[PDB]
Design a binder for this molecule. Structure first.
Ligand SMILES: CO/N=C(/C(=O)N[C@@H]1C(=O)N2C(C(=O)O)=C(CSc3nc(=O)c(=O)[nH]n3C)CS[C@H]12)c1csc(N)n1
Ligand code: NI
Ligand SMILES: [Zn+2]
Length: 358
């Protein structure tokens, strides 16, 4: 996926370079780097300065997060949030020939990271859904009222969908709740032993772990150490569960060579003792795990060393979830947004084919 859906080529979503430089309107599903290619390129800025009626649309949270970065503040005058599950009419003007197109857009929650949404577009060339990145459990799409008309799913011409784990190997992934419970109980069994027992959550430098931090903090009464928390300045229910102070039993700090540090009983922020008593440190790396069709779930926690663990965590839907979602949507066409590492377009397209009307 390179930004443009065939049905509405004058809009660009999650890609801002190359052909997307002529967009009549821009959309951002969420603040992950690989969906923000070109979003602050000079050539785009140049183009915004001679095209005054071009806006960027996203969720309220996405607006807030994007605008906390100094490098995207230039968007301030041109960003419009759209409320979640609130169908909103948008006008797309031709800068030169003066053509006018109207589209109605509805934001649906994607379950991927703070601010993450799917965009349902309705207009005079059919209904389309761009999912962005999503993780939706079975039944979640069936509950989304604005995907339906008169008790049946809307007629959807094309779905542009997150196919990150769209291969039958990734058949099942433990739920959000199961992942959280496993991590909670591992952390609780360690940090309640003494004040000197500490956990390092080894996380990627990306939004989407806040669900985990918030819940661990709420349940355990401990704030989580992070490198930077200023992006949540106006998000109290996230902010108050994080800290920049090193004196805490849960850390999600980050440092360029941080797994070497852990192999010498140092956390990334450098704290190794308190009252000259060494901290007893375990590492927990949230990581995607999956089970095949014919298997049962195994433990969300995998022990990798005396003091090291992997914990199930997924930003994206399983293959069974993708199939259930698309089966339910029953669009005419389905377009993979991404080719999983070990497969091809043809295999992914052909996996999806039987779930579509043409
Ligand atoms: C290499 O180190 N790996 C992991 C780990 O477990 N990674 C998982 C793996 O193999 N994954 C897959 C995928 O298949 O690409 C991905 C999908 S790639 C992607 N996801 C987005 O949401 C997005 O917006 N853009 N992009 C490009 C997620 S990580 C996961 C890790 C976890 S924590 C930590 N410190 N390292
Ligand atoms: Ni993402
Ligand atoms: Zn730390």
């Amino acid at each position: 996926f390179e930004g443009q859906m065939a049905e509405y080529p004058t809009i660009s979503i999650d890609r801002f370079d190359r052909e997307n430089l002529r967009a009549r309107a821009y959309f951002l599903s969420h603040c992950h780097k690989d969906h923000m290619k070109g979003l602050r390129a000079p050539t785009l800025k140049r183009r915004l300065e001679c095209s005054l009626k071009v806006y960027l649309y996203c969720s309220p949270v996405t607006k807030e997060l994007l605008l906390t970065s100094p490098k995207y503040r230039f968007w301030k005058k041109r960003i419009i949030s759209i409320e979640i599950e609130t169908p909103t009419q948008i006008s797309l003007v031709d800068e030169a020939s003066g053509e006018k197109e109207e589209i109605v857009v509805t934001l649906l929650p994607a379950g991927h990271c703070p601010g993450s949404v799917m965009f349902l577009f309705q207009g005079n060339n059919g209904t389309v859904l761009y999912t962005g990145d999503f993780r939706l459990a079975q039944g979640e799409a069936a509950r989304m009222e604005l995907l339906h008309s008169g008790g049946r799913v809307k007629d959807i011409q094309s779905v542009y969908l997150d196919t990150t784990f769209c291969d039958p190997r990734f058949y099942q992934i433990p739920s959000r709740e199961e992942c959280l419970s496993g991590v909670l109980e591992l952390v609780r069994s360690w940090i309640t032993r003494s004040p000197y027992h500490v956990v390092w959550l080894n996380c990627k430098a990306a939004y989407g772990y806040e669900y985990l931090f918030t819940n661990l903090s709420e349940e355990l009464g401990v704030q989580v150490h992070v490198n930077k928390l200023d992006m949540f300045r106006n998000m109290p229910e996230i902010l108050h569960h994080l800290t920049t102070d090193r004196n805490t039993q849960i850390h999600a700090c980050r440092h360029p060579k941080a797994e070497e540090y852990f192999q010498w009983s140092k956390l990334p922020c450098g704290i190794t003792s308190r009252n000259r008593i060494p901290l007893h440190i375990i590492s927990i790396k949230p990581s995607t795990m999956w089970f095949g069709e014919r298997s049962r779930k195994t433990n969300v926690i995998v022990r990798t060393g005396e003091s090291s663990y992997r914990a199930c965590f997924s930003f994206h839907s399983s293959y069974s979830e993708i199939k259930d979602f698309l089966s339910y949507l029953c669009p005419v066409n389905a377009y993979p947004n991404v080719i999983p590492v070990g497969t091809t377009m043809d295999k992914v397209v052909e996996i999806l084919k039987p779930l579509c009307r043409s």
